[PDB]
Design a binder for this molecule. Structure first.
Ligand code: FMN
Length: 135
């Protein structure tokens, strides 16, 4: 666990959630700047996106709207899904990754496990270290 980095770094986490699983997931981290895609009218600092998956492995509409406006500051993406969907499992992360040329930080089920939290937070630190100065 890199809780010290999570709680001290200035990295921003922006998420999208409909039934609250993504919300619950990010609340398992120690990141301090956590806001939903719908509660800001501008983004001026680099950020990490955590979203969910809708019909047929699609990116939620609210996330697509957000990205076409602030994808220039996107560092990487993580997506919540459900393996019941097979090949469409958390496909929004793959779509966003290819579309905006950013790395996939993690793909997990529903609210995630402690293992998902660990992998996600470690990847955020790696990408911030590698792309912060650049971004
Ligand atoms: C209409 C609908 C379509 C969904 N489609 C997919 C899908 O294609 N792939 C997947 O992995 N999960 C799919 N899911 C599952 C959600 O991505 C999953 O439950 C997610 O954790 C929900 O996050 P929410 O609380 O953040 O918004 C779907 C759920 C609903 C209600």
């Amino acid at each position: 666990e890199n809780l010290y980095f999570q709680s001290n770094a200035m990295v921003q986490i922006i998420f999208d959630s409909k039934t609250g699983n993504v919300q619950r997931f990010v609340n398992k981290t120690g990141f301090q700047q956590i806001r939903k895609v719908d509660e800001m009218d501008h983004v001026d600092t680099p950020f990490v996106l955590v979203t969910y998956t809708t019909n047929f492995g699609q990116v939620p509409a609210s996330t697509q709207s957000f990205l076409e406006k602030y994808a220039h500051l996107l560092l990487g993406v993580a997506a919540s899904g459900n393996k019941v969907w097979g090949d469409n499992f958390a496909k929004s992360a793959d779509t966003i990754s290819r579309q905006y040329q950013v790395p996939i930080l993690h793909k997990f089920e529903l609210s995630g496990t402690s293992k998902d939290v660990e992998l996600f937070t470690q990847e955020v630190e790696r990408v911030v270290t590698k792309s912060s100065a650049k971004m």
